[PDB]
Design a binder for this molecule. Structure first.
Ligand SMILES: O=C(Nc1cccc(C2=NCCN2)c1)c1ccc(-c2ccc(C(=O)Nc3cccc(C4=NCCN4)c3)cc2)cc1
Ligand SMILES: O=C(Nc1cccc(C2=NCCN2)c1)c1ccc(-c2ccc(C(=O)Nc3cccc(C4=NCCN4)c3)cc2)cc1
Lengths: 330, 330
C-alpha cells in the first residue's frame, strides 16, 4: 500500500522540476524534454530503493513526522530513484542494451540515441535541485548532498572496474573472487543498500560517524548477498516467478556463478573460453553443483547477516535491517 | 607566467585524486584508469577558465592569502577545468566529433568508445572530491558545491536546448535570435564566465545575493559576445592566428552568422536549406555584409559592457571584469 503513496508523489516531483518554465519560458522546450526523460526513465521499476528511504525513515522516528517531514522523506526517496535512473540510462548505452523494465531503452528510441547521455546527466542534476527545493533549510542538507555525491562516485568507480573486467571479449583470468566482491560493493551495494538507509538516518538526525559506519557494515554485506542471489537467479530462476530471463553468460559477465566455476574447474573444464560468449556453461555449472553451493552459501550468508545485525544495529532498531533481510531472503 | 603555476599544480591534483589506492587497493585498476582520463582530458586546452579563478581571487583579496589559501584557489581553478572536461568528453560523443584540442577525442580511442560516458561522469565526480579534500572546513564550502551543481545543470539545459535546435538535418525556422541567445546563455556563458568569478567571489567571503546577481549581469553579457565572436571567427578568422579552421555551417550549427543571415534574406536567399549541411553559405554571408554587421555589433557590445561594468561592478574592483574584457576584445 505504501509503495503507492510513494508512486503518487511523482507527478508532484515532476511538477516541481518543470516549474522554471513559469520564470524562464525561453528554456520551455528543454524543460518539456526533461519531463519526458523523467517519465520514461524514473517510472516502471519496483522502487525498492526509494521506498526503503520512507520505510526506514518512518521506522527511525515517532511523533516527529508532520506532513512536511514525510514530504521530504518521499522526495529524498525519489532522489534515490533518480540516481538509479541516471545510472541505468547511461549503463544501457554503454552495454548496448535493447530493453529495460520490459521497455525499449530510452536511448534506442528513434530521435534520442546518444543525446541520452545529456538526458542521463539531467537526471543526476535533478537530485540536487530536489534537495535544494525541499531540504536546504534542514540541518542534514549538506550531509545528504555529500551522501548522494559519494554514492555516485562509488558507483562510477564500480562501473569502471566492471568495464575493465568484462570488456564487451572472453578473459577469465580477471574473473576472481576478490574482483567480483569489489565490483558488487562499489557498483551496486553502496547506492542500493547503504545510500537509502543512510539518508533516512541523516533525516532522523542520526549523523554520527560511528553509527553510519555500523549501518554500512551490515548493509554492504546485504548488498553482496543480493547481487550474488541475483546472479544465481539470472540463470537458475524461474522467469515465470522473476519477470525476466537472464543473459549473463552470453554477455561475458563477471557472475558469481562463473567465479565459482573457475575456482572449481580442472583444466579440461577450465577451457571451456570456448563457450563463454554467444549454447550450454549451464550444463557445466550443474556438473559442479553450483545450485547446492549457492544453497549452502545462502544459509551461511543469512547466519552471518543476523550476527551482523546483532552486533552492529544498536542503537538503531533491528527492524530497519530485518525488514530488508526478509525481502532479500525469499 | 601565472598560467604555468596553475598548470604545475595538476600533478598534485592528480596525485591527490589517485590516493585511495593507498587505503583501498582492490580499486587500483579503476583508479589508474581515472588517472588516464584526467591526463588525457584535463590537459591540453588554454585553461582560461580555471586561470580566471586565480586571477580573480588574487585581485579580490591583499594580505589574506597564505600558501593554503592560494592552494585552494588553484584547486577550485582546476575544478572548473574538470567541469569543462566533463562537458567536452561527453559533448564529443554526442556530436560524433573526431578531434579535440588537436588530439583524437578520448572516446575515439580504440578500447574506450562508449565507456567514455562513465569516464566523463568520473571527471564530474572529481570536482566534489577536490572541494571536500581542500575546502570542507571553509565557510564557503556549501556555496561552492551548490555553484558547481547549478553550473552543471544550466549547462546541461543549454545542451538540451542546443540538441533540440540543431538536430544532427537542416531546419532554419528554429534558428532564431531569442533561441540563439538562450543557448549561449545556458550552455556557455554561465559556466565559462559567471562560474569562475562567482567561485573566486565566494572564496573571498563575498557571498551576497545582490553582488552575485550584479556580477552575473556583466558576465553573462560578456559570455554572449564571446560566443558570437567565436561564431564569426569560426568562418572569417585566420587559422594561422586562431589555431583551428571552422565547420559550423556543415554541422547545421545555430551560429550567430546563420541567425543574422535568416533575418536578412529575401525568400530567394532564404532557401538556400539547400547549402546548409555538407560548398559556399560563405558567399551569401559576404553578400549580406555580415562582417560589417559583426564589426558594428562588436563596437556596440563593447560600449554596452563598459556601461555594465560602470553600473554593476561596485563594490568589486572594475579590474576583475576589465581584465576579461580586454582578453575578449582582441
Ligand atoms: O516493499 C517491499 N520491500 C520493502 C521495500 C522498501 C523497504 C523495505 C524495508 N523493510 C524495512 C526496512 N525497509 C522493504 C517489497 C515488495 C516486493 C518485493 C519484491 C520485489 C522484487 C523481488 C525480486 O524481484 N527480487 C529481486 C531479485 C533480484 C533482483 C531484484 C532487483 N530489484 C532491484 C534491482 N534488482 C529483485 C522480490 C520482492 C520487495 C520488496
Ligand atoms: O591569461 C590570459 N587571460 C586571462 C586568463 C585568466 C584570467 C584573466 C583575467 N583578467 C582579470 C580577470 N581575469 C585573463 C590569456 C592569455 C591568452 C589568451 C588568449 C587565449 C585564447 C585566445 C583565443 O583563442 N580566443 C578565443 C577566441 C574564441 C574562443 C576561445 C576559446 N577559449 C576557450 C574556448 N574557446 C578563445 C585569445 C587570447 C587569453 C587569455
Amino acid at each position: 500500500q505504501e509503495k503507492q503513496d510513494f508512486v503518487q508523489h511523482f507527478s508532484q516531483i515532476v511538477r516541481v522540476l518543470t516549474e522554471d518554465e513559469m520564470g524562464h519560458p525561453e528554456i520551455g522546450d528543454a524543460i518539456a524534454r526533461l519531463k519526458e526523460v523523467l517519465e520514461y526513465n524514473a517510472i516502471g521499476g519496483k522502487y525498492n530503493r526509494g521506498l526503503t528511504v520512507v520505510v526506514a525513515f518512518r521506522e527511525l522516528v515517532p511523533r516527529k513526522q508532520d506532513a512536511d517531514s514525510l514530504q521530504r522523506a518521499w522526495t529524498v526517496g525519489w532522489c534515490v530513484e533518480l540516481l538509479q535512473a541516471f545510472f541505468l540510462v547511461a549503463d544501457d548505452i554503454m552495454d548496448s542494451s535493447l530493453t529495460r523494465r520490459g521497455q525499449i531503452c530510452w536511448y534506442q528510441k528513434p530521435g534520442v540515441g546518444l543525446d541520452a547521455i545529456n538526458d542521463a546527466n539531467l537526471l543526476e542534476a535533478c537530485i540536487y535541485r530536489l534537495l535544494k527545493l525541499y531540504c536546504r533549510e534542514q540541518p542534514y542538507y549538506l550531509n545528504l548532498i555529500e551522501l548522494f555525491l559519494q554514492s555516485s562516485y562509488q558507483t562510477e568507480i564500480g562501473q569502471t572496474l566492471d568495464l575493465l573486467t568484462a570488456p564487451q571479449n572472453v578473459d577469465l583470468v580477471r574473473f576472481t573472487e576478490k574482483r567480483y566482491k569489489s565490483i558488487v560493493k562499489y557498483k551496486t551495494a553502496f547506492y542500493s543498500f547503504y545510500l537509502p538507509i543512510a539518508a533516512a538516518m541523516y533525516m532522523a538526525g542520526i549523523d554520527g560517524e560511528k553509527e553510519h559506519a555500523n549501518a554500512k557494515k551490515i548493509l554492504l554485506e546485504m548488498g553482496e548477498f543480493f547481487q550474488i542471489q541475483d546472479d544465481y537467479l539470472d540463470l537458475f530462476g524461474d522467469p515465470s516467478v522473476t519477470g525476466k530471463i537472464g543473459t549473463d553468460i552470453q554477455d561475458n559477465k563477471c557472475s558469481w556463478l562463473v567465479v565459482q566455476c573457475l575456482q572449481r574447474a580442472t583444466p579440461e573444464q577450465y577451457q571451456i573460453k570456448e563457450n563463454y560468449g554467444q549454447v550450454a556453461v549451464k550444463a557445466l555449472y550443474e556438473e559442479l553443483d553450483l545450485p547446492a553451493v549457492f544453497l549452502q552459501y545462502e544459509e551461511d550468508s543469512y547466519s552471518h547477516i543476523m550476527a551482523l545485525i546483532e552486533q552492529y544495529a544498536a542503537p538503531l532498531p533491528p527492524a530497519v535491517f530485518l525488514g530488508l533481510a526478509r525481502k532479500i531472503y525469499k
